[PDB]
Amino acid sequence: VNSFSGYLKLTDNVYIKNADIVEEAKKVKPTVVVNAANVYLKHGGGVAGALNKATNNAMQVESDDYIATNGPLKVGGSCVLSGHNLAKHCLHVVGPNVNKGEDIQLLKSAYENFNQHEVLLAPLLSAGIFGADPIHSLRVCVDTVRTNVYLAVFDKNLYDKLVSSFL
Ligand SMILES: C[C@H]1CC[C@H](CO)N(c2ncnc3[nH]ccc23)C1
Ligand SMILES: [Cl-]
């Protein structure tokens, strides 16, 4: 039993809600919140920009040190950093950005990172400003993640479409 509330159950392990991931994280304080990261951990907009803003830029400061030490992530890769005031940990996961011409096939690799964590709060990878089809992203998620994932979808109109179109 966990404290996630108001989610629709899609499968044995995948749950979904129309919610603001920042406000969700602040309420639940999950062990792991997933960030929709880029390889440079530059958290300028989208989910990443909002999460970083909620940490008062502490996420960006920590991320800049991580990149200075380790270099960029891979598309499809991830790193675990602090969750600051939002969660114990933040799993920064890089889904392909279609608006950069990145291979959408890497979306499955991106979701595989979730399997290293028993429970996660997350957005749909490569959705929003990363320019992928969110219906496809949900399909890959459900078909890739085996651990317990609580998906937050910011747009109420998009949420209703994902549910009503979910197979
Ligand atoms: C991932 C991308 C697509 C699906 C979904 C729609 O709103 N979305 C978000 N969901 C929840 N919280 C959010 N904060 C900032 C953005 C955001 C953004
Ligand atoms: Cl977005």
Sequence-separated (6 or more) residues with CB below 8 Å from residue 61: none
Q: Find the Cα–Cα–Cα–Cα dihedral 94, 95, 101, 102, rounded to 10°.
A: 80
Beta strands across the sheet bearing 148-153? 8-9, 14-18, 148-153, 119-122, 32-36, 89-93, 78-82
Give resolution in angstroms: 1.0
Experimental method: X-ray
Annotated domain spans of the chain: 8-163
Q: Measured from the CB, is residue 47 less than 6 Å from ligand 1?
A: yes
* CATH, domain range 8-163: 3.40.220.10
Name the residue type at position 48. A
Contact 37, 73 (CB under 8 A): yes
Measured by CA distance, the residue closest to atom 8 of ligand 1 is 154
Measured by CA distance, the residue closest to atom 10 of ligand 1 is 154
Spacing, Cα 130 to ligand 1 middle (Å): 11
Q: Angle of helix 46-54 relative to helix 21-28, nearest 10 degrees?
A: 40
Classify each residue of 122-157 as buried b or exposed e, where b means 16 or more C-beta atoms within 10 Å of its C-beta: bbbbbbbebebebeebbbbbbebbeebbbbbbbeee
Q: Which of 60, 68, 67 is nearest to 39 (CA)?
A: 67
